[PDB]
Amino acid sequence: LLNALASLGHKGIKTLRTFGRAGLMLFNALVGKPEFRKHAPLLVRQLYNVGVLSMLIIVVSGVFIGMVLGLQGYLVLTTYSAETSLGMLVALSLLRELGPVVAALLFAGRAGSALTAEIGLMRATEQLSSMEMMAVDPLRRVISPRFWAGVISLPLLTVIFVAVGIWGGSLVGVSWKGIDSGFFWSAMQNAVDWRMDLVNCLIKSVVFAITVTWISLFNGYDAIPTSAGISRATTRTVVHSSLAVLGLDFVLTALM
Amino acid sequence: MLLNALASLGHKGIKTLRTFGRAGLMLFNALVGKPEFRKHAPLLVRQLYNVGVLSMLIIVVSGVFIGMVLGLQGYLVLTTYSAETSLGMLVALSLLRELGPVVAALLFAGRAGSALTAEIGLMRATEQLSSMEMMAVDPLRRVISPRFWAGVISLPLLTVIFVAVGIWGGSLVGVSWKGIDSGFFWSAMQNAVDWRMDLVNCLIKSVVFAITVTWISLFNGYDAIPTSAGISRATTRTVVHSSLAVLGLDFVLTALMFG
Amino acid sequence: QTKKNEIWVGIFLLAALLAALFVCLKYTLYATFDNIGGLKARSPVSIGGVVVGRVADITLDPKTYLPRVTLEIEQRYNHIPDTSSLSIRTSGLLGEQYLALNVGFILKDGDTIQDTKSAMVLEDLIGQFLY
Amino acid sequence: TKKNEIWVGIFLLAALLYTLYATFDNIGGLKARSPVSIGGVVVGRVADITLDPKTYLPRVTLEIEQRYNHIPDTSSLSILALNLKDGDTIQDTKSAMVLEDLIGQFLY
Amino acid sequence: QTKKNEIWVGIFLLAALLAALFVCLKAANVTPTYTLYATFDNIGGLKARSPVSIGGVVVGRVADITLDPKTYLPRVTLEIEQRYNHIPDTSSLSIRTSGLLGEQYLALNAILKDGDTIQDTKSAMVLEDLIGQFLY
Amino acid sequence: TKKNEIWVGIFLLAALLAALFVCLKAANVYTLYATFDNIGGLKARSPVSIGGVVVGRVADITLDPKTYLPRVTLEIEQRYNHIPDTSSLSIRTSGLLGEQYLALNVILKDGDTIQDTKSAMVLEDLIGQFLY
Amino acid sequence: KKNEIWVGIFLLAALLAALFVPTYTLYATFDNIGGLKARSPVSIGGVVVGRVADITLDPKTYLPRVTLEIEQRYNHIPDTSSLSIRTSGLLGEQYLALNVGILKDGDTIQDTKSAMVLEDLIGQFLY
Amino acid sequence: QTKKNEIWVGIFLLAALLAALFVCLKTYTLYATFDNIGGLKARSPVSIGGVVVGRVADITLDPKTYLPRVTLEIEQRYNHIPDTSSLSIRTSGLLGEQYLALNILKDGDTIQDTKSAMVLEDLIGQFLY
Amino acid sequence: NLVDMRDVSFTRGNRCIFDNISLTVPRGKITAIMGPSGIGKTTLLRLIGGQIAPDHGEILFDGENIPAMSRSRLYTVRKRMSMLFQSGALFTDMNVFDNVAYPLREHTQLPAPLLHSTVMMKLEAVGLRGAAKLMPSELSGGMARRAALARAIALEPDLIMFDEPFVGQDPITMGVLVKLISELNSALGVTCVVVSHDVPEVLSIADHAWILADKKIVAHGSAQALQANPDPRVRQFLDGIADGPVPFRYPAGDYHAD
Amino acid sequence: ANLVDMRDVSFTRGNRCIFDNISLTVPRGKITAIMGPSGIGKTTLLRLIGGQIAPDHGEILFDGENIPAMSRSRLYTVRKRMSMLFQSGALFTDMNVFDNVAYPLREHTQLPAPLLHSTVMMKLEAVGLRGAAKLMPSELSGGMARRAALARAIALEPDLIMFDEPFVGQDPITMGVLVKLISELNSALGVTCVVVSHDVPEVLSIADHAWILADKKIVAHGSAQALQANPDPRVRQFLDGIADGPVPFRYPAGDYHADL
Amino acid sequence: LSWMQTGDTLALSGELDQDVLLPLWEMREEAVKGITCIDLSRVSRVDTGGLALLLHLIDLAKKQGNNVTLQGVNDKVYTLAKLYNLPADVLPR
Amino acid sequence: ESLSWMQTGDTLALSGELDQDVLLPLWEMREEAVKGITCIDLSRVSRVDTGGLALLLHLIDLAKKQGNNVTLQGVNDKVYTLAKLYNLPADVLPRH
Numbered sequence A: 001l002l003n004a005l006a007s008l009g010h011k012g013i014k015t016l017r018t019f020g021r022a023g024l025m026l027f028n029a030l031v032g033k034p035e036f037r038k039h040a041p042l043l044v045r046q047l048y049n050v051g052v053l054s055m056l057i058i059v060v061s062g063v064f065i066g067m068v069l070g071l072q073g074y075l076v077l078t079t080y081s082a083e084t085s086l087g088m089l090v091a092l093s094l095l096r097e098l099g100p101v102v103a104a105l106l107f108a109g110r111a112g113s114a115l116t117a118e119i120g121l122m123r124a125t126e127q128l129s130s131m132e133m134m135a136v137d138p139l140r141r142v143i144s145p146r147f148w149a150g151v152i153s154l155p156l157l158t159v160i161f162v163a164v165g166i167w168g169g170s171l172v173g174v175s176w177k178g179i180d181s182g183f184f185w186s187a188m189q190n191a192v193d194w195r196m197d198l199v200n201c202l203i204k205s206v207v208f209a210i211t212v213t214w215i216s217l218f219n220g221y222d223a224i225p226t227s228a229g230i231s232r233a234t235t236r237t238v239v240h241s242s243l244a245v246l247g248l249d250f251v252l253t254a255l256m
Numbered sequence B: 001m002l003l004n005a006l007a008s009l010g011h012k013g014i015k016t017l018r019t020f021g022r023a024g025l026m027l028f029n030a031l032v033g034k035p036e037f038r039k040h041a042p043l044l045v046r047q048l049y050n051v052g053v054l055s056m057l058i059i060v061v062s063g064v065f066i067g068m069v070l071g072l073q074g075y076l077v078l079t080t081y082s083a084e085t086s087l088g089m090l091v092a093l094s095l096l097r098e099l100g101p102v103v104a105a106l107l108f109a110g111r112a113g114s115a116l117t118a119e120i121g122l123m124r125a126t127e128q129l130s131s132m133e134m135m136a137v138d139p140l141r142r143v144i145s146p147r148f149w150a151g152v153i154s155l156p157l158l159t160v161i162f163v164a165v166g167i168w169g170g171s172l173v174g175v176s177w178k179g180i181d182s183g184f185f186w187s188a189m190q191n192a193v194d195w196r197m198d199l200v201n202c203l204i205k206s207v208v209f210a211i212t213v214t215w216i217s218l219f220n221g222y223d224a225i226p227t228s229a230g231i232s233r234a235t236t237r238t239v240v241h242s243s244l245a246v247l248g249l250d251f252v253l254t255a256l257m258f259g
Numbered sequence C: 001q002t003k004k005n006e007i008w009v010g011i012f013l014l015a016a017l018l019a020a021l022f023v024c025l026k027y028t029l030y031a032t033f034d035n036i037g038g039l040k041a042r043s044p045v046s047i048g049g050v051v052v053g054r055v056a057d058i059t060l061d062p063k064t065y066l067p068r069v070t071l072e073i074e075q076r077y078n079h080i081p082d083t084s085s086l087s088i089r090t091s092g093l094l095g096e097q098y099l100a101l102n103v104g105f106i107l108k109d110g111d112t113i114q115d116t117k118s119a120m121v122l123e124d125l126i127g128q129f130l131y
Numbered sequence D: 001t002k003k004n005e006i007w008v009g010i011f012l013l014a015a016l017l018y019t020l021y022a023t024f025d026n027i028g029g030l031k032a033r034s035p036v037s038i039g040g041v042v043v044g045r046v047a048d049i050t051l052d053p054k055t056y057l058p059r060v061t062l063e064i065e066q067r068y069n070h071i072p073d074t075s076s077l078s079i080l081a082l083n084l085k086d087g088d089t090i091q092d093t094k095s096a097m098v099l100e101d102l103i104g105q106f107l108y
Numbered sequence E: 001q002t003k004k005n006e007i008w009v010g011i012f013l014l015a016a017l018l019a020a021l022f023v024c025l026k027a028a029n030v031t032p033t034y035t036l037y038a039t040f041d042n043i044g045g046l047k048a049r050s051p052v053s054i055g056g057v058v059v060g061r062v063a064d065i066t067l068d069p070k071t072y073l074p075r076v077t078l079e080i081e082q083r084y085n086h087i088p089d090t091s092s093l094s095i096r097t098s099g100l101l102g103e104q105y106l107a108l109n110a111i112l113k114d115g116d117t118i119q120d121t122k123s124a125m126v127l128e129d130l131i132g133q134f135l136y
Numbered sequence F: 001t002k003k004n005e006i007w008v009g010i011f012l013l014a015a016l017l018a019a020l021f022v023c024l025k026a027a028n029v030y031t032l033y034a035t036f037d038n039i040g041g042l043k044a045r046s047p048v049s050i051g052g053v054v055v056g057r058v059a060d061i062t063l064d065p066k067t068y069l070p071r072v073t074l075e076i077e078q079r080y081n082h083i084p085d086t087s088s089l090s091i092r093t094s095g096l097l098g099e100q101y102l103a104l105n106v107i108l109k110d111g112d113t114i115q116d117t118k119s120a121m122v123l124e125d126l127i128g129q130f131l132y
Numbered sequence G: 001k002k003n004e005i006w007v008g009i010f011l012l013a014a015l016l017a018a019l020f021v022p023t024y025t026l027y028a029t030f031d032n033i034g035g036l037k038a039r040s041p042v043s044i045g046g047v048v049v050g051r052v053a054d055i056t057l058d059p060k061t062y063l064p065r066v067t068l069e070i071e072q073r074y075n076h077i078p079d080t081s082s083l084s085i086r087t088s089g090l091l092g093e094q095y096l097a098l099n100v101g102i103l104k105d106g107d108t109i110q111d112t113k114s115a116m117v118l119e120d121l122i123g124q125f126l127y
Numbered sequence H: 001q002t003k004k005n006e007i008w009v010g011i012f013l014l015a016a017l018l019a020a021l022f023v024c025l026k027t028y029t030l031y032a033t034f035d036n037i038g039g040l041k042a043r044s045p046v047s048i049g050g051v052v053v054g055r056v057a058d059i060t061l062d063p064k065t066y067l068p069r070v071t072l073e074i075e076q077r078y079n080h081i082p083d084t085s086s087l088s089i090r091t092s093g094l095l096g097e098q099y100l101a102l103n104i105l106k107d108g109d110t111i112q113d114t115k116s117a118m119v120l121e122d123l124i125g126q127f128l129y
Numbered sequence I: 001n002l003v004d005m006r007d008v009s010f011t012r013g014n015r016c017i018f019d020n021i022s023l024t025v026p027r028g029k030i031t032a033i034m035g036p037s038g039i040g041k042t043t044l045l046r047l048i049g050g051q052i053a054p055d056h057g058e059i060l061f062d063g064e065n066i067p068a069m070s071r072s073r074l075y076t077v078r079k080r081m082s083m084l085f086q087s088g089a090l091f092t093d094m095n096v097f098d099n100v101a102y103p104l105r106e107h108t109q110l111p112a113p114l115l116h117s118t119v120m121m122k123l124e125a126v127g128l129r130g131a132a133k134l135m136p137s138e139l140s141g142g143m144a145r146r147a148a149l150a151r152a153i154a155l156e157p158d159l160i161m162f163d164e165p166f167v168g169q170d171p172i173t174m175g176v177l178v179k180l181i182s183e184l185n186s187a188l189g190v191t192c193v194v195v196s197h198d199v200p201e202v203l204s205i206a207d208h209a210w211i212l213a214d215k216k217i218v219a220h221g222s223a224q225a226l227q228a229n230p231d232p233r234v235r236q237f238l239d240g241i242a243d244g245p246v247p248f249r250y251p252a253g254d255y256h257a258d
Numbered sequence J: 001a002n003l004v005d006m007r008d009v010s011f012t013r014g015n016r017c018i019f020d021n022i023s024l025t026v027p028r029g030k031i032t033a034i035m036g037p038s039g040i041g042k043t044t045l046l047r048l049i050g051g052q053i054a055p056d057h058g059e060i061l062f063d064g065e066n067i068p069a070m071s072r073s074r075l076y077t078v079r080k081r082m083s084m085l086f087q088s089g090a091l092f093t094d095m096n097v098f099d100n101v102a103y104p105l106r107e108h109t110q111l112p113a114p115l116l117h118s119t120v121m122m123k124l125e126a127v128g129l130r131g132a133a134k135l136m137p138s139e140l141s142g143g144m145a146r147r148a149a150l151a152r153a154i155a156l157e158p159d160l161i162m163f164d165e166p167f168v169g170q171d172p173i174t175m176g177v178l179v180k181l182i183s184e185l186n187s188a189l190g191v192t193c194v195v196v197s198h199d200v201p202e203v204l205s206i207a208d209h210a211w212i213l214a215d216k217k218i219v220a221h222g223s224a225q226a227l228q229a230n231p232d233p234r235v236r237q238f239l240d241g242i243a244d245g246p247v248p249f250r251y252p253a254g255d256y257h258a259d260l
Numbered sequence K: 001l002s003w004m005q006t007g008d009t010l011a012l013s014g015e016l017d018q019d020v021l022l023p024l025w026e027m028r029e030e031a032v033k034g035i036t037c038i039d040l041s042r043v044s045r046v047d048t049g050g051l052a053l054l055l056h057l058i059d060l061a062k063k064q065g066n067n068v069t070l071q072g073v074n075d076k077v078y079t080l081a082k083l084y085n086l087p088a089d090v091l092p093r
Numbered sequence L: 001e002s003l004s005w006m007q008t009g010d011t012l013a014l015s016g017e018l019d020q021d022v023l024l025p026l027w028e029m030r031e032e033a034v035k036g037i038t039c040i041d042l043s044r045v046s047r048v049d050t051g052g053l054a055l056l057l058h059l060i061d062l063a064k065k066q067g068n069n070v071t072l073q074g075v076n077d078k079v080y081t082l083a084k085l086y087n088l089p090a091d092v093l094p095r096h
């Protein structure tokens, strides 16, 4: 009873110390701001490798996802009589079911698992402790511009993932199956999408962008400075982000 | 402009042709020769503990979160049609047509696919692949060949639990959260297609998904840079190339046998 | 101190997140009928078209074999006379059925209905019109 | 640190701790598990549907829950809606009217 | 590089608004209203945001149905556009439906200002009185 | 390496028990001849019936090459054998918008043709007799 | 070196081969339009010939007007065509079905049959 | 080899996967005139007795008297058709797919006997008035 | 007088790292700190800088106290240390010119014509005046230390500390960093310490040597008095002696075959 | 003698070249040292002897037979008599350290299990790591990882041991152990050791024929003592370890003005 | 800090490390045009950042047609010019 | 690689060159020359490794297990050359 329970508490304290260090490091980077003209060349540098470098994975997979949902949606509407209504299941599925859920998993591969690499490699070659030593805080130079590079670029990349896969019905329905463009676009006009499907999708993509950035900027900072520890933290960044996007999806869909 | 921009664009075409031909020669020499099952059969259990059963945390923690969200969003779509008894037709079909083995290959490439690149490439940085190359059989048949067949018999064997938990996750949101009867919710799945269209076609979809994922994982770890800056660069390169090899393959595979 | 400082900040961040999780998951009567039709649990009861509450359960009398249902009415409208009537009407033309309280010209907690009308039956609508 | 390792162990455990018989004329589109209602509220279903080899009439074997055992002889079945112990029969039955011949008495 | 990432992030910033005009101008209707009261006895399917109609065109919505606490009659608050201020007392109100199972809308066949009341209205139709009057 | 074969055998057992959840819980648990005039919406592999019970399926739907009348074939299992010759075949649907099925009502063995027929009715020509 | 230049124009040629593969306004006058909105299919015999721009309204008489469009190829239509608003089944698609029994830019058609609603027809057949 | 051998494998592997991206690609003409069409479109099913015999290539309008005309597509298995056979526009069910009912002519022929469709809004005007 | 530390006993977990050590350097002299590989040597410089916090003792620096100061008054005194690392401590996003000019671009008191002059002639001391437009990834292992050496003298500090210099280089590169260190103390007058364990190269320009054994201090002689010193422990570390206090064999059982 | 003879090897990878015309002999029973500066090819030089790479026009032999003329089976059965180690550690990490030394004698199934256990306990006793045969290689030291590969180096009785830069950044406590085992190796068994370390006072005390490699040419053919009296400037730059000399020592820079 | 002028020469007083060069930089083009000698007698210490401004006074002085001499210079400039190898911008001894 | 073992009494007549792979007829059959043997002769040899010495160390121990005594005569010099390399203790190779 007691010999197997004493080792259970050893992993229960280290979980609270790991999750407690992610809140203490973030609270030190969310303090009273300096002059914003200094971080203006530092913001466009950290927005290039996160926003622009994760643009090809969003757009190319956007036309591939939207054509599958248009093709598979035509199978379940053949048994029904709503074959002309391809405005649903190509747009409404990419707004609440897919969209911010599936593209956040693809954001954790190109810009999520590479964000913990460029901050984890600096812990091994002692670039963080050398930059700290001279005159500057390390938590406000390599983490704070990288925190705003994920909470802003991912809601701006989610609408690109929506607006690319939403004209797959112009390819699958129109000029392939023969669905009328007036019977496809106007079926999407009459659907009530202003509050439940437009701004509720935008709130869901904002809080998803904070959870991916908080884990990606912590696994590279809290790591053993060696080649095996960076690659171990790079693997655990995708697992902790996939269980946080899908984990906070059942809770967030109850407030529809 | 007309010649200087062409001299570097075509040079990348030769480099991406030499890179694409190296992955074919790595998998061909790892599967032919002498297929004995005396030295590689204890190695098959060793390479399945860190790939197959180690990937169970993304099956129990997940699955119940993708199964309930397909029943919660499915119940809101099935409103004002009086088709709430047909919720099992929405759950048991979507896990075998669009979801299921497609999203499980993305989870396998980020958990077992990312760890496979960080295993061979970590060994070649400390010169472990070149050590066994001059004292025993070359490591293409020793440490690559059991790792290839481990991921092949894993992803079809892991997607059958993903489609069983998500159906069980859809049964939890159906009869215990919305209050529909269990007599007609399961009988709607008894009239759904589960032969020649849904159960066979999802198995062959996951077999071809279990080849293109592990091919990039065994190539970026074998063909990499021995410095530490190229190990993490090739680790994040595996997830991006496997996501285009699964979602890009799903468009040309759903055109066949689905209409 | 650092070892004893990262524990209290970890149990306070999880307590604030679980408190944010609990906020993220957010008088009865009786009526004895002859036929209920297609009413189910949590079915709306209305008067004049506007809803005032819902029903709780739909049970059966073990002796007289008549369907007796229980409803609920909020405290905003209390002055209802005891000569009211209950009519079985459906929403629209073929939608889900509701209960229309046809009030007449004191109802406490635990009273029964008086003028209960039977539900619509399609088998007599083609029988009385023919025969 | 030993006393605070054995009490947080159980604190993590506390963080998780009878059949009737009837026959009809034309049953129509009747299928399996069709509910029978005592005036609307569900009480049971059907289990077996066969036809007679002599007169070829579709008989219906239905089941009622054992809480209701006060069923008179004047009980009639109408397609299932009900207007007798285990192993008894039901004689006065009205069957489902198909929509192909009721219009024939309306046209002519 | 400085002059290399600054060019590519400008295409990233215009794609944010290019994805914005492909949603608001395409999939939605985003691009000084007085209040009138009306009393019925059977509003039918009169829910919130019901389109007010005179001649088929939409001239406004409604806010919320409210029950009278004294005579137990339903009341609906009407909000019509400021462009139409020439409606007399003679104009009646008939609750109609746009089809068989269409949406129950309000059809409209001195001049009223803010605070005015109307007298002669017509409620919706119930299925029980229509088949009862046809047979009897 | 003793714990490796135990966890692999758990993974092999979890892959077999989960296959029973998509098989046992899911849907993986003589030929006659006739002809009609109007079919409606039938196709191949249709659940033919003698009033609500299923007995077989439809192989194909063909047409005559001389009069251009459609011929319908169906298979009936050997458990139900004695059927009279004046058993008319009528075309009905499962409710309102369900799949249509041949609802026959009561010895025609293999190779025999059912003579009496009753074709389906479209909604365009019944209103010509209903109103006029 | 020259073989690398030959495939450099071949990667460009393989890319380019994959990349290779008059209305005039009318006016109408109705009493009730029913479920009529923009982009409604106008027709003479079922085959669509145009659509509508918007539905306007005068603030004094309260008479809704339809701004429908006709292509230039259809030019033999007179002003005596009966614009009967027929509905397309039960979906409420009140399409403009004009029936000829010369309409150019800026003409009001006299023969205009309004869409009769179903709430007074039950008050007419029964009463 | 390092440079020579790794080129021929790359073009051979690209000639097998890109060739699989091209293998995913899943009559005599009659003529008739009309008055009302309804809800017909391209690839509309033409049928005898209820069973489909072909499709519809295109549908246009004759710009002289403004009468619609459609193009037919019948297979060569059925040829013995008379001029008595009419053509009515019906639907498959309540509001299903609009089809063409066909209750010896060759390619490049016409049918004079046809029956137009009826809109239920015009039926509501005749049943009331 | 003393400037580094009096008595530090830093333990990390259950394994002890330092057990009552005492270091004393002069002002403007080369101090040799020899130690075996595996003992705390990188974490010894972290206690003087302020990255980690010690448990017991005091760390004093010019009439002050290092573990008693806050975040303020520590950031301002830390500009006089300018430590150098074994690996590449310079960044990879910027070039070599922006790497040396980075610690002098936090104040920016010198304008843009004055900015290009003070960094270009500073690279002429280490010899990297011509390598001012290259990439740090293209540099070698010895040129990365000379790029951080010119970066360490950008603010003119008073106590430079190195982290095992020329530990794995050729003797051509090993002769560069020895002459560059000794010319910075003979002309500028800045104290710099060497913690490397290269006995025939650290004990060439040193003035005070410290031998590290059993996480304590066993010898504190100069560069001349430690060679002629009778001790079996400090002669084991010197001039490559295998057998001595280190038994060079793991303790085992009975050595019998079965 | 003449075990490799390395005649006319270049091994040009791309626009840069590693060697041009180096040619040195290796006698039998002696220890050959090839020293040189960092940055140039030193790890890739030992791969030419084993056969993992192929030169341009080279003449690498192994006792008469030609290594580019070898097949896949002829490249084997002579690689088993080399047993070249590495600097970063040529030992595995999935198993313990007892199975790490017994790796190249277990796939060669000719020794029974009582005789297999006695062979490893004699190999690890010669390097001083027999009492620590029950650990994982992740918690090993920097000098102890090279001693675990030295016990595996003599497991198959080789003829040419290649030391891929030993004790390059090690403690002189651990450097004295590695310099003693190699010097006592040729005094009892007679195996040629090829050391490519650049640490001058340790590589010259145990060698008999040193070969200084400077500017991809063998600029020294003398013994371990004859190179100290060589008046060549390229030779008297690496052995003594001076700052200035034939190298420009700062950079090949340009103009001193226009930057201030 | 003072930069007074006799009429042909100027005198430099105080320190010059990195931050007291700001008032001298804005008027560094008017205090060289009539200068034949530079004095640094009343100074304490000079570093690398202060020596950069001393190099930025000879580069615009020799282009007019007159050169400049140095008198009363401590050894701190002389032991620092050999570290950065300044051949002719700073006059030795 | 002749590997001839002949029982001429208590001399064992050990001849032949064994390194790693020809120890199988000698290890599987070793219960015939341990019971009455005192002297072991190693004169007609050329070279011996630690693989052949591993079988030799398990045979001096086996003849000392019944335990008359084991003495060695006519032994080559290569056996004691590597004995100081492997750090061999006493009472396992009697040379005097």
Ligand SMILES: Nc1ncnc2c1ncn2[C@@H]1O[C@H](COP(=O)(O)OP(=O)(O)NP(=O)(O)O)[C@@H](O)[C@H]1O
Binding pocket: I012, I017, I037, I038, I039, I040, I041, I042, I043, I044
């Ligand atoms: N954050 C840490 N967590 C655990 N162990 C640590 C940590 N920091 C240092 N150590 C250990 O503390 C000991 C002191 O090593 P260190 O101060 O780095 O000197 P060093 O060994 O000469 N440099 P190095 O050999 O590169 O580690 C080593 O055993 C480290 O592994």
Ligand SMILES: Nc1ncnc2c1ncn2[C@@H]1O[C@H](COP(=O)(O)OP(=O)(O)NP(=O)(O)O)[C@@H](O)[C@H]1O
Binding pocket: J038, J039, J040, J041, J042, J043, J044, J045
């Ligand atoms: N596969 C390769 N691709 C490109 N360059 C390579 C490759 N392998 C080796 N090199 C280069 O070839 C040169 C020879 O270096 P190497 O043989 O590793 O000896 P070394 O420099 O002493 N060891 P190290 O300093 O760790 O690289 C180096 O400049 C390497 O970067």
Ligand SMILES: [Mg+2]
Binding pocket: J042, J043, J087
């Ligand atoms: Mg190397």
